[PDB]
Ligand binder design. Sequence first.
Ligand SMILES: Nc1nc2c(ncn2[C@@H]2O[C@H](COP(=O)(O)OP(=O)(O)NP(=O)(O)O)[C@@H](O)[C@H]2O)c(=O)[nH]1
Ligand SMILES: [Cl-]
Ligand SMILES: [Cl-]
Ligand SMILES: [Mg+2]
Ligand SMILES: [Mn+2]
Ligand SMILES: [Mn+2]
Ligand code: NA
Ligand code: NA
Lengths: 173, 293, 515
Amino acid sequence: VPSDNLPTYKLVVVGDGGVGKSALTIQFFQKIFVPDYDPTIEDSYLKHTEIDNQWAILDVLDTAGLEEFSAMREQYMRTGDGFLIVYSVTDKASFEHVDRFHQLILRVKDRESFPMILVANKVDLMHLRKITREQGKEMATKHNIPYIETSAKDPPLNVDKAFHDLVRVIRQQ
Amino acid sequence: LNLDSIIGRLLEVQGSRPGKNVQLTENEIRGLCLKSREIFLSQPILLELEAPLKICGDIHGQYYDLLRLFEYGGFPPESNYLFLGDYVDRGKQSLETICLLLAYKIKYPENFFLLRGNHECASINRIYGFYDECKRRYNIKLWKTFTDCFNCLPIAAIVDEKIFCCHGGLSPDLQSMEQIRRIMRPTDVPDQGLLCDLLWSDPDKDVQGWGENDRGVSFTFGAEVVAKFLHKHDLDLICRAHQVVEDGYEFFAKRQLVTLFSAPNYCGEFDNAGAMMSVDETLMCSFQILKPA
Amino acid sequence: AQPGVAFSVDNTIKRPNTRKKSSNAEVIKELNKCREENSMRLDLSKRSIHILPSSIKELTQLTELYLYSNKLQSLPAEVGCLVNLMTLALSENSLTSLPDSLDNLKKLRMLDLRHNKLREIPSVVYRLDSLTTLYLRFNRITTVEKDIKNLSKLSMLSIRENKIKQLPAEIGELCNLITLDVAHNQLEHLPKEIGNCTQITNLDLQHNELLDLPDTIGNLSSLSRLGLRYNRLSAIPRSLAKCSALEELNLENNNISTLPESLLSSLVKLNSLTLARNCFQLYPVGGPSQFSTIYSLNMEHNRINKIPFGIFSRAKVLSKLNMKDNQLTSLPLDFGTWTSMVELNLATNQLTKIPEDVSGLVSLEVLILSNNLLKKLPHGLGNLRKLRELDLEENKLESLPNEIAYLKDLQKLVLTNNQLTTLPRGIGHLTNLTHLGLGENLLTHLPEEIGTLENLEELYLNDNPNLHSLPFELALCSKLSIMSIENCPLSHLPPQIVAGGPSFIIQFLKMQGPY
Ligand SMILES: Nc1nc2c(ncn2[C@@H]2O[C@H](COP(=O)(O)OP(=O)(O)NP(=O)(O)O)[C@@H](O)[C@H]2O)c(=O)[nH]1
Ligand SMILES: [Cl-]
Ligand SMILES: [Cl-]
Ligand SMILES: [Mg+2]
Ligand SMILES: [Mn+2]
Ligand SMILES: [Mn+2]
Ligand code: NA
Ligand code: NA
């Protein structure tokens, strides 16, 4: 039973197209893996959940990765309290565009630092992996942000932890 | 698939002694599941329906009571129908019940609608009858085909912008109707969350706000939660099922919510009546009662 | 006209029974703050706005207006004064119309009308010829008027999740379209003039009622994403071969029986082909160069009666083949040449034997042979040293070869619904086996070598009427968490113990055994 007048954390998932932003989000909320690719314009999801024995409302904004679908992306990012920067370990360009999304977050929020976590997705595709764990930790340390590896495919890996850790950053806990 | 022969054979036992089974072939039942599944996926998960319409609650395999509903309200397509789920389990003829409903869904896809109930779930109907009936009369592989079909049923419906329909009830996570549209199909029912609450939650006159449900799953919600939900979304009524009520229908929160249960003499242990709700084009709602026979 | 709920009960008619001024005061304050700062962007989203105040007419400097997630049924005519507006975001409202004054917005590029209640495209939208992006997803639209030709600058048009039955031929005048999404509608045909939209790279037609595709579809030479699943397509046009940038051709759930000969050979970027849920009785005709680029081939739920010889001779990267639910009675003679095959599904066919040259599939990790007519298994099955999953459910297997002990990587072995009486004593060499399904069989006993299955977690012995006892060595399976014994009498065990279930049974074997 949720408490009354709960805090809402507006989490925004950003990253290049096809990295798995929607699959991670649907896995987090519906606990299923969606194998088909349908490009996102914008979708939002809401749940009440208890993190570290503190109740919270999680409003997750799932944004567009494709440039053709990316109109109004900055407005949806402007409303966020924290960000998941997602890239696919099988997509080299998605890893190289982390710098661009890091800059966009700070620019849209008009701050020098902001809660964000680097998410390396699709680690279940070991034979197709092109970005090493060391490269990811180097990128995260360069931006002074946490690093986590996820997989939206069943059985899911670190999917709930990624969203919960971002809430922990926002709380400063 | 010859729909008319299947429907005719299902309707043949009208007036016979209660319990007389109908023998469809395994490939005929498989065709009903596969063809109805396609239609469910071709239609929204949040149905937007128009009156006139007749709305029915739990059937639970009581096939001859289902035939009484159609005889009273008019067999399709004489009247439009919306069922709120729980078609299998508990009763003795779940196969006949769901096969006729699926046949009508294929025959009249724009005038006949079926929502998902908490018993349209593999983990639930494995325990409470449908698995045993499928195994006894056919095979377990057919039971899995039903599960694939159930996993694509729509979850809720809104009639003429004013009546929100679902099997169970409200959810603390239900803040916008678009959240329902974002539920992906095919899907199983999770043990917790939005889709779970829509099929499992119950109203409670004693609870203020949200409370724990004695079912062990989902929540209970009070009258003020109902009032705030209707005001926020500009709705007039919540129409749900899920709970057995003595008169077949029962009001809640000053007639802001109604529970419909359409299985008279439920499980052989209750002395309850069944009811459907008729909604005319002006949204005037009346109740047709099935007394326990 | 909007009806309201009432109840005809008790011989009468009964009816079901916050701070709007305060909410509108906060909106007015946000409007004044916008002019004082002379900001070019106004965010009034998620403010429960039903009627937008007419004071918006003063904010003529606006280039972006965000009003999504409100309760707007209409927009005031004063919005037409915002002649500098470039973005109008109105998703998730209750809009049924738009004011004619919007034609003053000669610089509008983005109009987002997703999740509303439009029964038609508002007539003023057809006059906004400056638009480049138009979203109309999740409405109640049935008709696209011929006036759509006025929006010739559109590069993105999405009208999915509506009730559209036909598109006008004037859709061909949208020559600047890059993405066209008309999924989840009721289209039966596409106008042949769609071939004039030669810049389209993404065309989504999934979940319609399309009986065919126009022969002009090949004019979309830059098409890289094409959605065709869940339609009624009876054929594929030859011109589709010109769309050589297609990375995937998924035709699942249609009525297609053939493909144009050598069509796939022109799709040189094709990494996946799916012909599932169609009417194919034979493979796509055309030489093996048609399968030289795909990694996966899915042809489940068809009527394919034979796999041609040498069909995969040039399929070097084809590692997944799904042939479930077809009409296969035998396998080709070069079955053993499928050395690239990693996952093979031959379930629900009429196979009577698996050939001995299956040993050539050394890279095979998943082999699914469920619902066939197998009476035995070849000895060459033991050469599949990489096999993790072997599914043999619903066959007529009367025995297992002793060479099954060589499957050192086998983790899941499903033998449900067969005629097995005993298991080879080499079954204990499958050290990685975690799942062993032996239900619906005729087993008289389990070999004592079952105690060498150190990783056995799930064992299924249900529906075995002739299994009267279990070996004491089964207690040596320390990870055994699941054991199904439903409809399994076990006569040689005490009836109170078998009624107590696997917990009492495993402990009996443990406490009444020599371990
Ligand atoms: N194997 C595997 N596939 C994954 C994983 N995550 C996503 N995918 C697949 O990759 C594809 C793209 O996923 P999706 O969530 O749609 O990507 P996206 O970031 O939302 N793209 P966009 O921004 O355009 O909407 C889908 O086919 C999805 O099933 C993963 O962890 N493992
Ligand atoms: Cl409607
Ligand atoms: Cl409100
Ligand atoms: Mg996405
Ligand atoms: Mn129920
Ligand atoms: Mn029920
Ligand atoms: Na959800
Ligand atoms: Na069909």
